[PDB]
Design an enzyme around this catalytic site. Structure first.
Site, short mmCIF file in Angstrom:
data_model
loop_
_atom_site.label_atom_id
_atom_site.label_comp_id
_atom_site.label_asym_id
_atom_site.label_seq_id
_atom_site.Cartn_x
_atom_site.Cartn_y
_atom_site.Cartn_z
N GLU A 35 0.84 -1.22 0.00
CA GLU A 35 0.00 0.00 0.00
C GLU A 35 0.88 1.28 0.00
OE1 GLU A 35 -3.01 0.36 -0.65
OE2 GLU A 35 -4.02 -1.58 -0.22
N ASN A 46 -7.23 9.06 -5.77
CA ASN A 46 -8.05 8.07 -6.48
C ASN A 46 -8.78 8.77 -7.64
OD1 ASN A 46 -7.33 6.06 -4.48
ND2 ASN A 46 -8.67 7.14 -3.01
N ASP A 48 -11.85 8.88 -8.33
CA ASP A 48 -13.07 9.52 -7.90
C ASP A 48 -12.88 10.85 -7.20
OD1 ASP A 48 -12.43 8.65 -5.33
OD2 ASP A 48 -14.33 7.70 -4.90
N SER A 50 -11.31 11.12 -4.24
CA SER A 50 -10.93 10.84 -2.85
C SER A 50 -9.40 10.59 -2.85
CB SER A 50 -11.69 9.60 -2.33
OG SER A 50 -11.24 8.41 -2.99
N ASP A 52 -6.13 8.41 -0.69
CA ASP A 52 -5.75 7.37 0.28
C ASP A 52 -4.53 7.90 1.05
OD1 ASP A 52 -7.57 5.47 -0.77
OD2 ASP A 52 -6.02 4.26 -1.67
N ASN A 59 -8.81 5.57 2.89
CA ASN A 59 -9.53 6.39 1.92
C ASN A 59 -10.42 7.43 2.56
OD1 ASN A 59 -10.65 7.17 -0.46
ND2 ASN A 59 -11.53 5.21 -1.03
#
Ligand code: NA
EC number: 3.2.1.17
Length: 129
Positions: A35, A46, A48, A50, A52, A59
């Site tokens: 990650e 991301n 969309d 958003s 992380d 998120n």
């Protein structure tokens, strides 16, 4: 802070993740490796809009507030910046809530695609834990 592999394992242990919802420590290490490369300051946007955050790429769509993810929740009740701290308590506490929500560690797409079904015990080889 960029944790070492064993250093992170021991901090995750201390914070109660080993066998949390049944996932052994090496699962959590493997997930952190892929990650964030064990970097608490890791951020990635991301598609969309958003973002992380942190060692386990938590998120803003659901879990933390960064004030720029319109139409999101903050289910861990924290600013996403708290997830970037060298002290991993906030990340850990939130990861507990995520892993409890129905999909277990499948919530971490790197865990599912890169750790799930593999030899994750290797991730904690030679650590004094
Ligand atoms: Na949010």
């Amino acid at each position: 802070k960029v944790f070492g592999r064993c250093e992170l394992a021991a901090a995750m242990k201390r914070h109660g993740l080993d066998n949390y919802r049944g996932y052994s420590l090496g699962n959590w290490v493997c997930a952190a490796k892929f990650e964030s490369n064990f970097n608490t300051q890791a951020t990635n946007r991301n598609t969309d809009g958003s973002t992380d955050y942190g060692i386990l790429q938590i998120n803003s769509r659901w879990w933390c507030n960064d004030g720029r993810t319109p139409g999101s929740r903050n289910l861990c009740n924290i600013p996403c910046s708290a997830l970037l701290s060298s002290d991993i308590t906030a990340s850990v506490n939130c990861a507990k809530k995520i892993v409890s929500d129905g999909n277990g560690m499948n919530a971490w797409v790197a865990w599912r695609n890169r750790c799930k079904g593999t030899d994750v015990q290797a991730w904690i080889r030679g650590c004094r834990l």
